[PDB]
């Protein structure tokens, strides 16, 4: 789902928030991003890349 | 005369601010220390 709180799990990582497409371009390895907070900010979809 | 020393006068207090970014050191410094203390209040999550 998009644009509703949810809770989230990606390969076990979880998490609560609001899921929309980013613009972040990670190089391909990369799985997913964070924050100066060391916060969860980006996933990337494992089925959808 | 005074009006040329005034008039002159503040034309230098552009220029002694428009380059010397340490004329504000105060007031950047308030917010850099508030700044920092909420990182260390986040980065204090992350701690078991
Ligand atoms: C499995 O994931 C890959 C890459 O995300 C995708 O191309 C593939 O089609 C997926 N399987 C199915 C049945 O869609």
Same mark, same amino acid.
């Given at each position: &789902? @998009?644009? @509703?709180? &949810? ?12 899921? %929309?497409?980013?613009? @972040? @371009?990670?190089?391909?390895?990369? $799985? ?7 916060? %969860?900010?980006? &996933?990337?979809?494992? $089925?959808?890349? | 005369?005074?009006?040329? #020393?005034? =008039?002159? !006068?503040?034309?230098?207090?552009? *220029?002694?601010?428009?380059?010397? !970014? ?6 950047? *410094?308030?917010? =850099? #220390? =508030?700044?920092?203390?909420? =990182?260390?209040?986040?980065? #204090?999550?992350?701690?078991?």
């Amino acid at each position: &789902v @998009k644009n @509703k709180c &949810v809770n989230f799990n990606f390969n076990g990582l979880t998490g609560t928030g609001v899921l %929309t497409e980013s613009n @972040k @371009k990670f190089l391909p390895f990369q $799985q997913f991003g964070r924050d100066i907070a060391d916060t %969860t900010d980006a &996933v990337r979809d494992p $089925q959808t890349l | 005369l005074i009006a040329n #020393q005034f =008039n002159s !006068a503040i034309g230098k207090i552009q *220029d002694s601010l428009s380059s010397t !970014a340490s004329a504000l050191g105060k007031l950047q *410094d308030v917010v =850099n #220390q =508030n700044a920092q203390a909420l =990182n260390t209040l986040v980065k #204090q999550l992350s701690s078991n």
